[PDB]
Design a protein around this ligand. Structure first.
Ligand code: HEM
Ligand SMILES: N=C(N)c1ccsc1
Length: 291
């Protein structure tokens, strides 16, 4: 299966910077959401989940087709709560109807990361909506109650190695688990709408206890009020993951650079970019624009 990026007709960097800006301004305006966490984290999770259906073996799933807009994928149990991010983006799409759904969902994630003071994430346009019958079945996103070997094997399907996996998981510094969405409850650090390397510092420095939550699932809890999923905690149980966790806990810039690469790759998996395509766009933040 081949998906060739096709630039939305006549559009260039400035058009996409305008969509960025709309998203970024709404992120600012709608600050109350989720006990004043705001929509940044859920937009990052949305961009990951629309990308994380990809299968390298046959190029099914992936961000290209924008298939999250269809009921089967929208109602994936793994996607519970992301309707909030979709609803956030609806007025943006209404204002910019020319952008594809896949470009919008992925640009949402990029915008959120940058506006939360994360790394710059280069982003490429040209995802094209595909029909309802291209929507991947439920069950391609990962379970949270598993161990390091599960995580490693899972991410091979997405063509991600150990470093890419550990880098990507640093996003779990953002937002929180919600018991009603996933059967897990709690945040991963104190600054959960600012993008930092706190996930790794918390993994290493907190005193974690294995407890049951009110949904009868096990999770790791600290007296600080933080939590880790079993899959999060597996990153310090496996000796190879642990080395990389320590590396990112001790080098903010290295984490930023490695996250940026892995996140762009995640968002671009499955897509063929013509040699004549535009170079990746690097959007200015509102702050950089004086906006
Ligand atoms: C082994 C891989 C992964 C597992 C099992 C997993 C699991 C989870 C679960 C259970 C939640 C809570 C959802 C809720 O209750 O609302 C969640 C949230 C989150 N995930 Fe992951 N995830 C994984 C990887 C990733 C990756 C690769 C990213 C993106 C780079 C990511 C970004 C986030 C973000 C930002 C949230 C917070 C959402 C919010 O606050 O609304 N996750 N994840
Ligand atoms: N480890 C955490 N608190 C977490 C995991 C997914 S979103 C937040």
């Amino acid at each position: 299966l081949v998906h060739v990026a096709s630039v939305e007709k006549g559009r260039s960097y400035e058009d996409f910077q305008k969509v960025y800006n709309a998203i970024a301004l709404k992120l600012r305006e709608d600050d109350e959401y989720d006990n004043y966490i705001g929509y940044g984290p859920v937009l990052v999770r949305l961009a990951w989940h629309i990308s994380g259906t990809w299968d390298k073996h046959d190029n099914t799933g992936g961000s290209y087709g924008g298939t999250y807009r269809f009921k089967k994928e929208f109602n994936d149990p793994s996607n519970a709560g992301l309707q909030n991010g979709f609803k956030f983006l609806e007025p943006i799409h209404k204002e910019f109807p020319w952008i594809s759904s896949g470009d919008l969902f992925s640009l949402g994630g990029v915008t959120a990361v940058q506006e939360m003071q994360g790394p710059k994430i280069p982003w490429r346009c040209g995802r094209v909506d595909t029909p309802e019958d291209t929507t991947p079945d439920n069950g391609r996103l990962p379970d949270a109650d598993k161990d390091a070997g599960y995580v490693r094997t899972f991410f091979q399907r997405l063509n991600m190695n150990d470093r890419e996996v550990v880098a990507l998981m640093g996003a779990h510094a953002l937002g929180k688990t919600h018991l009603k969405n996933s059967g897990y409850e709690g945040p991963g650090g104190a600054a959960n709408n600012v993008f930092t390397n706190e996930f790794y510092l918390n993994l290493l420095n907190e005193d974690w206890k294995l407890e049951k939550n009110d949904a009868n699932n096990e999770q790791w809890d600290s007296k600080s009020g933080y939590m880790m999923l079993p899959t999060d905690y597996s990153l310090i149980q496996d000796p190879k993951y642990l080395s990389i966790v320590k590396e990112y806990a001790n080098d903010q810039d290295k984490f930023f650079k490695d996250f940026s690469k892995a996140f762009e790759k995640l968002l671009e998996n499955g897509i063929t970019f013509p040699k004549d395509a535009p170079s990746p766009f690097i959007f200015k933040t509102l702050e950089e624009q004086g906006l």
